Amino acid sequence: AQYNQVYSTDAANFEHVDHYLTAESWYRPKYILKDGKTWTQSTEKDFRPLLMTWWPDQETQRQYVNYMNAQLGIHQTYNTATSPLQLNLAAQTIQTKIEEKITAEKNTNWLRQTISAFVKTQSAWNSDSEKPFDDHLQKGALLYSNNSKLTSQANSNYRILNRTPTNQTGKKDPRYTADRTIGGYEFLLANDVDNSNPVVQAEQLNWLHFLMNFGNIYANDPDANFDSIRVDAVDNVDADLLQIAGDYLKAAKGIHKNDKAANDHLSILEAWSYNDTPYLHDDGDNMINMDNRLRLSLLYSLAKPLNQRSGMNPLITNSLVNRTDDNAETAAVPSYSFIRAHDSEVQDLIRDIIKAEINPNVVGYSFTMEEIKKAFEIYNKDLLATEKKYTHYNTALSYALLLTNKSSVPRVYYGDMFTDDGQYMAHKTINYEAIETLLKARIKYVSGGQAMRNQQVGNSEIITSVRYGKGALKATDTGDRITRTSGVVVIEGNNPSLRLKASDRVVVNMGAAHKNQAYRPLLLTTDNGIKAYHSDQEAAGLVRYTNDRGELIFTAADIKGYANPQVSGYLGVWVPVGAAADQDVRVAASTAPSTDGKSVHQNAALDSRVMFEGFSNFQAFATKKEEYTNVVIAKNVDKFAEWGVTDFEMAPQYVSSTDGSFLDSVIQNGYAFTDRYDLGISKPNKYGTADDLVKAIKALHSKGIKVMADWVPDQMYALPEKEVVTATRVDKYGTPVAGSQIKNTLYVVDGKSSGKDQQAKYGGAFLEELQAKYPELFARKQISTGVPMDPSVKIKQWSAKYFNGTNILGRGAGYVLKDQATNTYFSLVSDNTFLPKSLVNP
Ligand SMILES: [Ca+2]
């Protein structure tokens, strides 16, 4: 009893977390039985495990012997009936065996680990006590208490949950009713940063300013700054951040002054709710959101299996813009449009394949490397099939619409041109040719008003989409020479069974600048795929003409249904003959002052832009310098210019954590990180070193292309230090879970950064200069909080007080040790020390 008791009650003598004890705590006894033979004075070296001498109750002390008796090849176990006098010799005999064996392996590392193992067999100490699970992607979350006496350094006056755009004020906005929900939820993955905390808000701003000045700050090269941002996971953070970022863009860059300034820094949100667009629009169009309705329209009218496909009309009317006749010089609301992204309609399809053909109980997207590579074999083959079971149909049809549509900036996804897996840019998809063709055509032909028509012919239907030519917003505008040699027509059908009757005609009005004119093909579907024409000359054979009225006319000879690996339906695209090799109908943004109170205007100059999402989650890791993405990017900067890419959306560049607790930290895309400022600085990121990054930003600038920084304020992964928090089990809205055991109960999280990383170096480092240069930013009272940001304290080190909570860690409800008698946590704070009766007073 005696020797074992604690050496001294100092914090010094125990391994503790915020002065609390855990099941895995080691400490300094007064003596060590040396080689289980002789009672020698401890030194600051002789640390043992608590569990070696103390148990939270007798039932646990029992298991421990049984378990331990196993390990030490002691051949005796005890069932529930056992006295405690035997439970007490059982552990003393083990204790000798423990020293004897430490002497023998000259170490205790092996113990560290028999201990750690055992701890995990107990309910109070594993994920058993953390049930019931909920539908958080990592199975559950813990909300940290704002007011706990036990964990005062984790207290917060904030932690205001769920203030999405729709719900920013804590009530659902009456203004936006397309989404009838509250438009998002707080807890998405990992450690959830509390973005309602004014100090944290200021820190998000610091980081924004940093990214946007990355060149100057890191390389001293004004030519290497990110030009613009994406706000990630908008519907999972506090929407004040939208005001802050827009306020910034305004103050620092002048985006509200004129279009040229707004388009040099054109920024986007990833905001899934239908409410978010009108919300953004009332906010002043300081950034643009995706057109989610059009995305769904493409997906269901074009990309789904033949039996699940819907009719085509939504391709015209289910959108931010009704494209039946779109003749506005400036659209009501700006947006960007896409059909796939790094996550959307890619990692889903892999999940579909794993869940179907590999591991049926796979959770969320928590995949393994193994499963994935296995998944990819199936997927890649499905890509080449005519009958697809897992992957998109009609990719080229979707791009034809996206790249010819008026009133939205198209975003092309990397993985629709290159293989989603695979070294960067090494392999082309079968659609690369058609997409590149469309991209090139867009620069040269795509300008003017738009008309879309849905026509029931033969046994099915087609839609026709028409751009009138540069300088004709309406069908009746005759324009000038360049109008005449610009414009385009797209014809599409979504049913392989489409047959026209002999008497059918599809009559397309091309616009008044196009009477009696030659047209030639750009893309035509063929039995095996799609044939691309790279020049008039190339398509010399297949010319057709409009008539007196400027109508093209199409017939059964032109239009029928196909099924091949690229087309399930019909695609045809025609362009006028005679465009100068170097014709370009894009249009530069005006310096004329903006006057409608909005920053971004969806006009012809904005339509002239094209966005490129330049990565895939599932890219292979580089084998060598040459294969690093950012290296490869700098080296093909010309292609991007040739495609008319004006905004290059780089992947997040933060060094990835490697915990594997979610997809993002398995394929290391850059959304899972521990250091916000570590852009390939401490070691390379998936995409190269900080220098490769700097070089790729420079390369893209040299072509005049803009580069977007993914701004990811929602969460952080794998913090290095432990902290104790008062936690509660909650669902993703922060509501307490029914039937859980963790309710204002102490928990051990990984919630502290190292205080020695880049964050330590740059955190809050620019606040002072920001307040001098842009006092207006700090004057705003943020919506959710009612108060201004708080730059008066810098964040050099993240700790739990800056977080809402975390995903569940499997440590258990009882990990932090409590005297079950008094039901009170043990503590090592000095004026109030409380230890287990046996270790201090035996
Ligand atoms: Ca959040």
UniProtKB/Swiss-Prot annotation:
Its EC number is 2.4.1.5. It is found in: Secreted. The keyword Glycosyltransferase applies. It catalyses: [(1->6)-alpha-D-glucosyl](n) + sucrose = [(1->6)-alpha-D-glucosyl](n+1) + D-fructose. Changing A11V: In strain: GS-5 and MT4467. The keyword Disulfide bond does not apply. It comes from the Bacteria. One of its GO terms (molecular function) is dextransucrase activity. Keywords: Dental caries, Glycosyltransferase, Repeat, Secreted, Signal, Transferase. One of its GO terms (biological process) is glucan biosynthetic process. Residues 5-805 are annotated as: Catalytic. Its main location: secreted. Production of extracellular glucans, that are thought to play a key role in the development of the dental plaque because of their ability to adhere to smooth surfaces and mediate the aggregation of bacterial cells and food debris. GTF-I synthesizes water-insoluble glucans (alpha 1,3-linked glucose and some 1,6 linkages), GTF-S synthesizes water-soluble glucans (alpha 1,6-glucose). GTF-SI synthesizes both forms of glucans. Belongs to the glycosyl hydrolase 70 family. This is Glucosyltransferase-SI. It comes from Streptococcus mutans serotype c (strain ATCC 700610 / UA159).
